Tab-separated table of C-alpha atoms in Angstrom:
chain	number	residue	atom	x	y	z
A	1	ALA	CA	79.911	23.174	37.180
A	2	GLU	CA	76.428	24.668	36.462
A	3	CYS	CA	73.913	22.929	38.727
A	4	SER	CA	76.817	20.676	40.043
A	5	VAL	CA	79.825	21.115	42.260
A	6	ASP	CA	82.952	18.979	42.654
A	7	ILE	CA	84.206	18.830	46.271
A	8	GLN	CA	87.048	16.962	47.875
A	9	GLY	CA	87.623	15.705	51.392
A	10	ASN	CA	91.310	15.090	52.136
A	11	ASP	CA	93.219	13.080	54.798
A	12	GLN	CA	93.632	16.172	57.014
A	13	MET	CA	89.772	16.317	57.528
A	14	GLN	CA	89.283	19.211	55.177
A	15	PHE	CA	86.755	19.841	52.400
A	16	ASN	CA	88.082	22.038	49.561
A	17	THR	CA	85.119	24.436	49.970
A	18	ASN	CA	83.388	26.161	52.826
A	19	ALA	CA	80.449	27.517	50.815
A	20	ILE	CA	78.182	26.310	48.052
A	21	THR	CA	75.552	28.390	46.171
A	22	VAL	CA	72.651	26.714	44.387
A	23	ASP	CA	71.459	28.667	41.348
A	24	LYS	CA	67.675	28.931	41.742
A	25	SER	CA	67.186	28.139	38.020
A	26	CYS	CA	68.568	24.625	38.566
A	27	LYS	CA	65.880	21.950	38.578
A	28	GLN	CA	68.249	19.523	40.357
A	29	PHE	CA	71.757	19.975	41.793
A	30	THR	CA	74.511	17.347	41.851
A	31	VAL	CA	77.420	17.198	44.351
A	32	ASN	CA	80.425	15.007	43.297
A	33	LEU	CA	82.572	14.046	46.259
A	34	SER	CA	86.077	12.547	45.864
A	35	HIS	CA	88.672	11.752	48.449
A	36	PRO	CA	92.334	12.517	47.568
A	37	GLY	CA	94.855	10.912	49.958
A	38	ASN	CA	95.712	7.372	51.278
A	39	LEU	CA	93.643	6.829	54.375
A	40	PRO	CA	90.975	4.068	54.429
A	41	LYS	CA	87.259	4.484	55.120
A	42	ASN	CA	87.236	3.152	58.765
A	43	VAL	CA	89.792	5.812	59.666
A	44	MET	CA	89.023	8.653	57.319
A	45	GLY	CA	85.678	8.033	55.601
A	46	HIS	CA	83.934	11.218	54.363
A	47	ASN	CA	80.315	11.810	53.423
A	48	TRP	CA	78.591	15.046	52.315
A	49	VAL	CA	75.271	15.470	54.138
A	50	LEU	CA	72.867	18.412	53.741
A	51	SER	CA	70.300	19.755	56.255
A	52	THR	CA	69.125	23.148	57.525
A	53	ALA	CA	71.544	24.739	60.014
A	54	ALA	CA	69.057	24.103	62.794
A	55	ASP	CA	68.998	20.326	62.029
A	56	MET	CA	72.710	19.759	61.605
A	57	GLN	CA	73.405	18.967	65.235
A	58	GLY	CA	70.610	16.421	65.671
A	59	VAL	CA	71.636	14.633	62.462
A	60	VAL	CA	75.337	14.557	63.511
A	61	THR	CA	74.474	13.144	67.012
A	62	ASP	CA	72.018	10.524	65.696
A	63	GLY	CA	74.351	9.636	62.842
A	64	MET	CA	77.122	8.866	65.301
A	65	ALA	CA	74.801	6.436	67.182
A	66	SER	CA	73.824	4.535	63.947
A	67	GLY	CA	77.480	3.923	63.437
A	68	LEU	CA	79.848	2.347	61.168
A	69	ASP	CA	77.520	0.015	59.351
A	70	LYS	CA	74.966	2.741	58.621
A	71	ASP	CA	77.536	5.314	57.293
A	72	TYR	CA	77.079	7.301	60.490
A	73	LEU	CA	73.566	8.348	59.436
A	74	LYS	CA	70.154	7.529	60.844
A	75	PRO	CA	68.306	5.571	58.129
A	76	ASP	CA	65.397	7.551	56.829
A	77	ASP	CA	66.368	10.601	58.751
A	78	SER	CA	63.828	13.244	57.722
A	79	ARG	CA	66.134	16.191	58.469
A	80	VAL	CA	68.627	15.050	55.782
A	81	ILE	CA	67.794	16.743	52.483
A	82	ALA	CA	70.442	14.719	50.569
A	83	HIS	CA	73.723	12.846	51.330
A	84	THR	CA	76.432	10.737	49.703
A	85	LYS	CA	77.634	7.480	51.177
A	86	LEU	CA	80.884	7.424	53.163
A	87	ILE	CA	83.951	6.985	50.967
A	88	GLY	CA	87.608	6.259	51.715
A	89	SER	CA	90.562	7.602	49.709
A	90	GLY	CA	90.383	7.043	45.978
A	91	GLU	CA	86.589	6.536	46.079
A	92	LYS	CA	84.009	8.890	44.600
A	93	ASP	CA	80.238	9.276	45.196
A	94	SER	CA	77.786	11.774	43.710
A	95	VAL	CA	74.232	12.857	44.809
A	96	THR	CA	71.551	14.699	42.820
A	97	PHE	CA	68.571	16.276	44.682
A	98	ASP	CA	65.659	18.431	43.622
A	99	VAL	CA	66.342	22.126	44.195
A	100	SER	CA	62.608	22.544	45.101
A	101	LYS	CA	63.348	21.010	48.489
A	102	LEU	CA	65.175	24.290	49.315
A	103	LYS	CA	63.452	27.542	50.230
A	104	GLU	CA	64.935	30.951	49.543
A	105	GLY	CA	65.991	32.668	52.754
A	106	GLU	CA	66.443	29.472	54.785
A	107	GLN	CA	69.967	28.562	55.955
A	108	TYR	CA	71.587	25.230	55.063
A	109	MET	CA	74.727	23.436	56.218
A	110	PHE	CA	76.619	20.650	54.540
A	111	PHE	CA	78.898	18.480	56.701
A	112	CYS	CA	80.541	15.083	57.222
A	113	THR	CA	79.193	12.810	60.055
A	114	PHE	CA	82.332	10.700	60.720
A	115	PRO	CA	82.650	10.816	64.594
A	116	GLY	CA	84.630	13.836	65.689
A	117	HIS	CA	85.313	15.146	62.181
A	118	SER	CA	82.083	17.215	61.705
A	119	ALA	CA	83.525	20.251	63.493
A	120	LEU	CA	86.333	20.397	60.971
A	121	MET	CA	84.190	19.396	57.949
A	122	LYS	CA	81.197	21.711	57.464
A	123	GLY	CA	80.147	24.669	55.395
A	124	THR	CA	77.182	26.648	54.228
A	125	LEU	CA	74.905	26.155	51.237
A	126	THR	CA	72.572	28.881	50.010
A	127	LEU	CA	70.046	29.179	47.137
A	128	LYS	CA	70.703	32.144	44.822
B	1	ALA	CA	97.045	12.592	92.504
B	2	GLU	CA	100.361	14.503	92.704
B	3	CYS	CA	102.203	11.703	90.794
B	4	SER	CA	99.409	10.190	88.651
B	5	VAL	CA	96.697	11.421	86.348
B	6	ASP	CA	93.664	9.643	84.860
B	7	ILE	CA	92.876	10.726	81.323
B	8	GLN	CA	90.068	9.884	78.911
B	9	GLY	CA	89.851	9.962	75.144
B	10	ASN	CA	86.256	9.686	73.836
B	11	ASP	CA	84.234	9.072	70.687
B	12	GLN	CA	84.300	12.713	69.696
B	13	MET	CA	88.089	12.439	69.322
B	14	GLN	CA	88.852	14.488	72.434
B	15	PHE	CA	90.854	14.095	75.584
B	16	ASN	CA	89.474	15.218	78.934
B	17	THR	CA	92.535	17.514	79.508
B	18	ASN	CA	94.974	19.525	77.434
B	19	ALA	CA	97.592	20.495	80.131
B	20	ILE	CA	99.264	18.204	82.677
B	21	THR	CA	101.673	19.389	85.422
B	22	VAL	CA	104.252	16.962	86.791
B	23	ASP	CA	105.502	18.077	90.152
B	24	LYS	CA	109.297	17.968	90.420
B	25	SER	CA	109.103	16.062	93.733
B	26	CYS	CA	107.611	13.049	91.978
B	27	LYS	CA	110.170	10.395	91.270
B	28	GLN	CA	107.826	8.743	88.760
B	29	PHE	CA	104.604	9.783	87.033
B	30	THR	CA	101.740	7.393	86.056
B	31	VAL	CA	99.168	8.099	83.365
B	32	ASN	CA	96.045	5.948	83.339
B	33	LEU	CA	94.238	6.036	79.964
B	34	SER	CA	90.626	4.917	79.478
B	35	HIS	CA	88.319	5.289	76.541
B	36	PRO	CA	84.660	5.963	77.310
B	37	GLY	CA	82.313	5.391	74.417
B	38	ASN	CA	81.382	2.744	71.940
B	39	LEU	CA	83.674	2.876	68.920
B	40	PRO	CA	86.267	0.125	68.298
B	41	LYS	CA	90.021	0.548	68.139
B	42	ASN	CA	90.352	0.638	64.309
B	43	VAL	CA	87.767	3.474	64.023
B	44	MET	CA	88.485	5.550	67.170
B	45	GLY	CA	91.636	4.106	68.735
B	46	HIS	CA	93.429	6.306	71.297
B	47	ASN	CA	96.913	6.293	72.786
B	48	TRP	CA	98.727	8.908	74.965
B	49	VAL	CA	102.234	9.622	73.605
B	50	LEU	CA	104.817	12.057	75.106
B	51	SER	CA	107.673	13.866	73.274
B	52	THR	CA	109.103	17.364	73.258
B	53	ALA	CA	106.962	19.891	71.335
B	54	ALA	CA	109.620	19.946	68.572
B	55	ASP	CA	109.407	16.221	68.004
B	56	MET	CA	105.643	15.871	68.047
B	57	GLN	CA	105.103	16.365	64.362
B	58	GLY	CA	107.562	13.750	63.340
B	59	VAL	CA	106.344	11.158	65.874
B	60	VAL	CA	102.793	11.674	64.541
B	61	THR	CA	103.848	11.478	60.856
B	62	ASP	CA	105.998	8.357	61.325
B	63	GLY	CA	103.369	6.894	63.674
B	64	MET	CA	100.622	7.366	61.167
B	65	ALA	CA	102.823	5.785	58.614
B	66	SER	CA	103.490	2.684	60.798
B	67	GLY	CA	99.841	1.456	60.462
B	68	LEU	CA	97.368	-0.012	63.031
B	69	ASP	CA	99.348	-3.220	63.299
B	70	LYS	CA	102.106	-1.129	65.035
B	71	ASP	CA	99.614	0.917	67.158
B	72	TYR	CA	100.426	3.851	64.901
B	73	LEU	CA	103.851	4.299	66.531
B	74	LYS	CA	107.265	3.774	64.864
B	75	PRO	CA	109.064	0.891	66.770
B	76	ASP	CA	111.752	2.074	69.164
B	77	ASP	CA	111.161	5.727	68.337
B	78	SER	CA	113.781	7.577	70.528
B	79	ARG	CA	111.719	10.782	70.358
B	80	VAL	CA	109.008	9.082	72.415
B	81	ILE	CA	109.652	9.688	76.094
B	82	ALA	CA	106.707	7.452	77.084
B	83	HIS	CA	103.492	6.077	75.525
B	84	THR	CA	100.508	3.838	76.219
B	85	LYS	CA	99.153	1.137	73.842
B	86	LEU	CA	96.345	2.089	71.395
B	87	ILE	CA	92.981	1.280	73.088
B	88	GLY	CA	89.471	1.013	71.650
B	89	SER	CA	86.390	1.958	73.792
B	90	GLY	CA	86.022	0.135	77.090
B	91	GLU	CA	89.759	-0.591	77.140
B	92	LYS	CA	92.299	0.932	79.506
B	93	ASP	CA	96.127	1.091	79.807
B	94	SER	CA	98.689	2.578	82.234
B	95	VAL	CA	102.241	3.818	81.753
B	96	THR	CA	104.676	5.055	84.463
B	97	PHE	CA	107.831	7.085	83.636
B	98	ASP	CA	110.805	8.478	85.385
B	99	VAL	CA	110.447	12.172	85.983
B	100	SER	CA	114.297	12.496	85.558
B	101	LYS	CA	113.926	12.291	81.814
B	102	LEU	CA	112.075	15.645	81.805
B	103	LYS	CA	114.159	18.770	82.231
B	104	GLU	CA	112.928	22.146	83.338
B	105	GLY	CA	112.732	24.798	80.687
B	106	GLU	CA	111.794	22.356	77.923
B	107	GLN	CA	108.320	22.252	76.316
B	108	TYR	CA	106.723	18.780	76.200
B	109	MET	CA	103.458	17.793	74.422
B	110	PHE	CA	101.357	14.714	74.906
B	111	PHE	CA	99.207	13.597	71.989
B	112	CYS	CA	97.452	10.784	70.131
B	113	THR	CA	99.061	9.387	66.886
B	114	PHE	CA	95.901	7.692	65.530
B	115	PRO	CA	95.219	9.379	62.055
B	116	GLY	CA	93.660	12.825	62.403
B	117	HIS	CA	93.460	12.645	66.206
B	118	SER	CA	96.401	14.957	67.024
B	119	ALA	CA	94.359	17.903	65.583
B	120	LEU	CA	92.378	18.015	68.817
B	121	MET	CA	93.940	15.391	71.043
B	122	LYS	CA	97.041	17.009	72.308
B	123	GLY	CA	98.092	19.092	75.289
B	124	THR	CA	101.092	20.416	77.189
B	125	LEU	CA	103.016	18.682	79.963
B	126	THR	CA	105.003	20.867	82.292
B	127	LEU	CA	107.378	20.254	85.214
B	128	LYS	CA	106.525	22.409	88.246
C	1	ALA	CA	77.433	15.071	93.776
C	2	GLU	CA	74.967	12.603	91.914
C	3	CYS	CA	72.816	15.569	90.791
C	4	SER	CA	75.703	17.861	89.814
C	5	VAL	CA	78.679	17.876	87.426
C	6	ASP	CA	81.902	19.893	87.195
C	7	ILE	CA	82.785	21.243	83.723
C	8	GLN	CA	85.978	23.077	82.724
C	9	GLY	CA	86.432	25.076	79.630
C	10	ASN	CA	90.086	25.822	78.908
C	11	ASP	CA	92.359	28.094	76.740
C	12	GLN	CA	92.401	25.590	73.894
C	13	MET	CA	88.573	26.257	73.470
C	14	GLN	CA	87.458	22.841	74.720
C	15	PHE	CA	85.337	21.446	77.499
C	16	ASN	CA	86.454	18.486	79.624
C	17	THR	CA	83.344	16.412	78.733
C	18	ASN	CA	81.092	16.040	75.795
C	19	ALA	CA	78.245	14.050	77.442
C	20	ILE	CA	76.230	14.628	80.681
C	21	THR	CA	73.436	12.274	81.832
C	22	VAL	CA	70.948	13.603	84.429
C	23	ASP	CA	69.479	10.992	86.662
C	24	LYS	CA	65.717	11.155	86.515
C	25	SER	CA	65.428	11.013	90.384
C	26	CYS	CA	67.100	14.442	90.662
C	27	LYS	CA	64.640	17.266	91.416
C	28	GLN	CA	67.285	19.831	90.367
C	29	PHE	CA	70.733	19.420	88.649
C	30	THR	CA	73.798	21.704	89.188
C	31	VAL	CA	76.583	22.514	86.712
C	32	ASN	CA	79.816	23.901	88.227
C	33	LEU	CA	81.843	25.664	85.539
C	34	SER	CA	85.477	26.734	85.957
C	35	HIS	CA	87.954	28.043	83.414
C	36	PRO	CA	91.506	26.654	83.800
C	37	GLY	CA	94.116	28.744	81.895
C	38	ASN	CA	95.368	32.321	81.684
C	39	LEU	CA	93.424	34.060	78.857
C	40	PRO	CA	91.017	36.999	79.588
C	41	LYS	CA	87.249	36.960	79.070
C	42	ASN	CA	87.177	39.241	76.025
C	43	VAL	CA	89.348	36.700	74.174
C	44	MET	CA	88.474	33.261	75.627
C	45	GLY	CA	85.336	33.782	77.755
C	46	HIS	CA	83.325	30.575	78.365
C	47	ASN	CA	79.770	29.854	79.482
C	48	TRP	CA	77.622	26.659	79.700
C	49	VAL	CA	74.242	27.041	78.044
C	50	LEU	CA	71.534	24.323	77.691
C	51	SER	CA	68.742	23.985	75.038
C	52	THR	CA	67.138	21.200	72.948
C	53	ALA	CA	69.346	20.038	70.029
C	54	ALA	CA	67.039	21.762	67.531
C	55	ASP	CA	67.223	25.141	69.279
C	56	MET	CA	70.996	25.225	69.770
C	57	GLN	CA	71.601	27.046	66.446
C	58	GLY	CA	69.151	29.835	67.065
C	59	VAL	CA	70.507	30.335	70.556
C	60	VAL	CA	74.169	30.507	69.363
C	61	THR	CA	73.361	32.851	66.428
C	62	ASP	CA	71.310	35.208	68.635
C	63	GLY	CA	73.857	35.036	71.477
C	64	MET	CA	76.610	36.087	69.149
C	65	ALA	CA	74.329	38.945	68.005
C	66	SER	CA	73.795	40.173	71.678
C	67	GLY	CA	77.548	40.710	72.209
C	68	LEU	CA	80.032	40.434	75.086
C	69	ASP	CA	78.063	42.892	77.204
C	70	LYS	CA	75.132	40.452	77.249
C	71	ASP	CA	77.393	37.451	77.899
C	72	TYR	CA	76.795	36.570	74.300
C	73	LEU	CA	73.207	35.530	75.065
C	74	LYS	CA	69.867	37.013	74.050
C	75	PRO	CA	68.310	38.298	77.276
C	76	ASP	CA	65.274	36.308	78.217
C	77	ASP	CA	65.855	33.818	75.433
C	78	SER	CA	62.956	31.359	75.840
C	79	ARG	CA	64.885	28.424	74.320
C	80	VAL	CA	67.549	28.486	77.023
C	81	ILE	CA	66.665	25.987	79.697
C	82	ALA	CA	69.599	27.059	81.950
C	83	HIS	CA	72.972	28.858	81.636
C	84	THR	CA	75.878	30.195	83.615
C	85	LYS	CA	77.439	33.662	83.248
C	86	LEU	CA	80.371	34.080	80.808
C	87	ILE	CA	83.672	33.639	82.701
C	88	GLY	CA	87.322	34.393	82.092
C	89	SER	CA	90.306	32.313	83.362
C	90	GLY	CA	90.565	31.776	87.051
C	91	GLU	CA	86.831	32.443	87.424
C	92	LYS	CA	84.052	29.966	88.323
C	93	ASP	CA	80.231	30.001	88.144
C	94	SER	CA	77.565	27.372	88.980
C	95	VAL	CA	73.917	27.104	87.932
C	96	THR	CA	71.221	24.836	89.353
C	97	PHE	CA	68.060	24.043	87.357
C	98	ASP	CA	64.859	22.033	87.714
C	99	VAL	CA	64.882	18.621	86.111
C	100	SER	CA	61.100	18.953	85.430
C	101	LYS	CA	61.996	21.172	82.492
C	102	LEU	CA	63.535	18.126	80.729
C	103	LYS	CA	61.723	15.074	79.496
C	104	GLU	CA	62.793	11.625	78.431
C	105	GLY	CA	62.946	11.144	74.695
C	106	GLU	CA	64.189	14.717	73.939
C	107	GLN	CA	67.752	15.485	72.703
C	108	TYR	CA	69.427	18.322	74.701
C	109	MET	CA	72.809	19.939	73.887
C	110	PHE	CA	74.997	22.016	76.243
C	111	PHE	CA	77.350	24.477	74.505
C	112	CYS	CA	79.346	27.734	74.744
C	113	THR	CA	77.987	30.851	72.843
C	114	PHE	CA	81.171	32.953	72.729
C	115	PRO	CA	81.767	33.339	68.917
C	116	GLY	CA	83.369	30.274	67.428
C	117	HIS	CA	83.370	28.214	70.702
C	118	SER	CA	80.314	25.958	69.906
C	119	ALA	CA	82.309	24.312	67.098
C	120	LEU	CA	84.286	22.368	69.739
C	121	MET	CA	82.498	23.262	72.992
C	122	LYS	CA	79.226	21.336	72.872
C	123	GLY	CA	77.998	17.946	74.129
C	124	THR	CA	74.772	16.034	74.669
C	125	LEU	CA	72.771	16.229	77.883
C	126	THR	CA	70.436	13.273	78.384
C	127	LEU	CA	67.747	12.515	81.001
C	128	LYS	CA	67.975	8.889	82.152
D	1	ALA	CA	98.346	33.331	41.290
D	2	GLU	CA	101.780	34.309	39.793
D	3	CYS	CA	103.982	33.944	42.959
D	4	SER	CA	101.137	35.334	45.053
D	5	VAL	CA	97.927	34.011	46.504
D	6	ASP	CA	94.927	35.897	47.892
D	7	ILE	CA	93.388	34.076	50.844
D	8	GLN	CA	90.476	34.854	53.116
D	9	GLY	CA	89.686	34.006	56.694
D	10	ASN	CA	85.876	34.082	57.551
D	11	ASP	CA	83.985	34.314	60.875
D	12	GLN	CA	83.603	30.561	61.138
D	13	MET	CA	87.392	30.089	61.650
D	14	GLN	CA	88.062	28.878	58.123
D	15	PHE	CA	90.667	29.892	55.528
D	16	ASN	CA	89.487	29.532	51.967
D	17	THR	CA	92.400	27.347	51.007
D	18	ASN	CA	94.289	24.553	52.734
D	19	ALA	CA	97.231	23.930	50.438
D	20	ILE	CA	99.616	26.542	48.934
D	21	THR	CA	102.171	25.633	46.286
D	22	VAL	CA	105.143	27.997	45.799
D	23	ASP	CA	106.847	27.480	42.460
D	24	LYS	CA	110.658	27.246	42.678
D	25	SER	CA	111.083	29.904	39.990
D	26	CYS	CA	109.670	32.545	42.368
D	27	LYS	CA	112.267	34.779	43.961
D	28	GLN	CA	109.574	36.017	46.452
D	29	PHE	CA	106.104	34.903	47.317
D	30	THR	CA	103.280	37.138	48.509
D	31	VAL	CA	100.205	36.246	50.556
D	32	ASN	CA	97.315	38.689	50.678
D	33	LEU	CA	95.006	38.019	53.581
D	34	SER	CA	91.499	39.510	54.006
D	35	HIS	CA	88.834	38.897	56.631
D	36	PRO	CA	85.232	38.836	55.309
D	37	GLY	CA	82.638	38.993	58.104
D	38	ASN	CA	81.624	41.096	61.113
D	39	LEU	CA	83.474	39.816	64.114
D	40	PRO	CA	86.110	42.005	65.849
D	41	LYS	CA	89.760	41.071	66.323
D	42	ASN	CA	89.547	40.051	70.031
D	43	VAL	CA	87.018	37.355	69.088
D	44	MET	CA	88.003	36.404	65.557
D	45	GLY	CA	91.356	38.032	64.699
D	46	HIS	CA	93.155	36.058	61.918
D	47	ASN	CA	96.838	36.050	60.880
D	48	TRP	CA	98.641	33.800	58.363
D	49	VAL	CA	101.871	32.447	59.914
D	50	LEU	CA	104.416	30.160	58.133
D	51	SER	CA	106.884	27.720	59.731
D	52	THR	CA	108.144	24.176	59.183
D	53	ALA	CA	105.671	21.515	60.240
D	54	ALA	CA	108.016	20.762	63.193
D	55	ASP	CA	108.007	24.279	64.598
D	56	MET	CA	104.317	24.971	64.297
D	57	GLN	CA	103.342	23.625	67.740
D	58	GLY	CA	105.938	25.721	69.561
D	59	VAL	CA	105.126	28.775	67.495
D	60	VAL	CA	101.430	28.226	68.487
D	61	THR	CA	102.172	27.694	72.227
D	62	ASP	CA	104.376	30.751	72.508
D	63	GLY	CA	102.039	32.943	70.444
D	64	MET	CA	99.244	32.142	72.884
D	65	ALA	CA	101.398	33.301	75.775
D	66	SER	CA	102.344	36.602	73.944
D	67	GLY	CA	98.856	38.113	74.039
D	68	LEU	CA	96.415	39.982	71.814
D	69	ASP	CA	98.448	43.162	72.061
D	70	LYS	CA	101.389	41.217	70.538
D	71	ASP	CA	98.949	39.681	67.940
D	72	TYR	CA	99.519	36.241	69.537
D	73	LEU	CA	103.018	35.905	68.086
D	74	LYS	CA	106.177	35.810	70.187
D	75	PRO	CA	108.209	38.852	69.014
D	76	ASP	CA	111.149	38.044	66.730
D	77	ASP	CA	110.328	34.329	66.825
D	78	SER	CA	113.154	32.552	64.921
D	79	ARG	CA	110.854	29.803	63.729
D	80	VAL	CA	108.427	32.132	61.964
D	81	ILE	CA	109.412	32.349	58.280
D	82	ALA	CA	106.836	35.002	57.471
D	83	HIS	CA	103.580	36.307	58.971
D	84	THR	CA	100.849	38.937	58.702
D	85	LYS	CA	99.467	40.924	61.626
D	86	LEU	CA	96.216	39.775	63.361
D	87	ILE	CA	93.240	41.327	61.462
D	88	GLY	CA	89.623	41.669	62.478
D	89	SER	CA	86.846	41.757	59.955
D	90	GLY	CA	86.923	44.422	57.361
D	91	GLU	CA	90.754	44.526	57.390
D	92	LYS	CA	93.483	43.321	54.996
D	93	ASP	CA	97.223	42.549	55.420
D	94	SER	CA	99.780	41.000	53.070
D	95	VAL	CA	103.298	39.546	53.508
D	96	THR	CA	106.004	39.024	50.853
D	97	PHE	CA	108.986	36.752	51.748
D	98	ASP	CA	112.023	35.422	49.819
D	99	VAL	CA	111.654	31.948	48.508
D	100	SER	CA	115.342	31.247	49.341
D	101	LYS	CA	114.216	30.685	52.971
D	102	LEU	CA	112.458	27.466	51.898
D	103	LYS	CA	114.341	24.308	50.869
D	104	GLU	CA	113.393	21.148	48.978
D	105	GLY	CA	112.076	18.203	51.047
D	106	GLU	CA	111.067	20.122	54.152
D	107	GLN	CA	107.358	20.247	55.131
D	108	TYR	CA	105.809	23.702	55.859
D	109	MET	CA	102.562	24.573	57.575
D	110	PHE	CA	100.621	27.862	57.466
D	111	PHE	CA	98.252	28.481	60.390
D	112	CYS	CA	96.592	31.162	62.442
D	113	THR	CA	97.837	31.549	66.055
D	114	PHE	CA	94.665	33.022	67.640
D	115	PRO	CA	94.089	30.840	70.814
D	116	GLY	CA	92.028	27.651	70.114
D	117	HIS	CA	91.697	28.390	66.379
D	118	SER	CA	94.926	26.867	64.842
D	119	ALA	CA	93.454	23.311	64.776
D	120	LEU	CA	90.796	24.733	62.455
D	121	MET	CA	92.963	27.138	60.461
D	122	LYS	CA	95.993	25.417	59.077
D	123	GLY	CA	97.167	24.009	55.787
D	124	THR	CA	100.255	22.944	53.912
D	125	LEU	CA	102.742	25.014	51.901
D	126	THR	CA	104.881	23.133	49.368
D	127	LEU	CA	107.886	24.374	47.221
D	128	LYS	CA	107.504	22.790	43.699
């Protein structure tokens, strides 16, 4: 994966990576999320959401209040740099975003906003 | 108080307590479960289930496997000392059990069998 | 009561609540923090710290940098609206603050700054 | 790797893998644990402990009661198949165990027993 990364969310509320690096020479970066396992989206739906570390908490709180129907994300949330939809087992979603929306030296966090799973599903993303 | 406890499971997939003490003088013990929040039973359902620590894993696994239609509990599971029904937010349930079924010197755990919930929603129960 | 709340942080690294609402007719609000359990402060010390949602990350990261000696909080940290001391099991601490420092419309978070604790020990505080 | 795996535990309470497969052909299996980061052992000590899925909760409860000085593991615990010592950042430990102590069709869990961290640091081990 050069300018892309393949990441999996399983039924035990675990991503298969805790850390992503974005090569600064990438014009865009793609994340391809899949969900191994058997659990359905209402019970174990995963999304991959990106924001700065300082924004993560506000996005997670507000996403919980938009609920179910809105994929646990505030529509047009300005703190969200990029995100997939919420997928259940056996689904896949990908998201491509412009690497110019990231500054060198700033800290970023990727996470899932399913209620109560964010604490277990989060990691860091850094430009390199 | 003394022979009853009120317990809450919320939308952040947490219980308000992780250790309960049942006084040996109680002939019976009553647990009153309520679910503050907003999320419905098929997204954030909660139940309070009691087994020995050694049996917890298997009750959870077979519960999970039984599906929502069985309140995520295997029917007539003999490992389950006592259990409430699965409740969505704004619902409540109550269960009373005979303290004679607990023996001193054994480790008991109470937990939720809804998928993924036992990771945080669990706690000890101890005769004193 | 009415303008106060009792919070417990335990040995499983959780708080007993994840949402506090402060009634707008309160001139001051008091948090009473206790630590049920048996673990010492250098291993499972807890505190209750309040900031806006967007400042929580800076406060946690700088707290962790100040170390156990400084109760894992940057001295005179201007983003902290109010906080208790860091306590071990069997200890208690209470803090009262002025409600005029909050405003309707703003997202507040309460959390614990002992390393690792904010992952589970956090909740929303809201002025209603 | 060939009947060995190198795994890391970071300061955000995360192992860098959540599933370990032991091939049946292995007479022994080795785990090599390292702790990247800066946090000391009383705050963020990590250990890799193996047991059946059924014994994990009791191994976790009794480890908590044994104390930091005993590396949060009950001494000579019958349920522990293999384990490392508790390591702070900058340290390394490894453990080699005989694969004849595992049997087909039994579920095994690896986890850390530092208080409050096992819900975040656990995964599956499978004999294939």
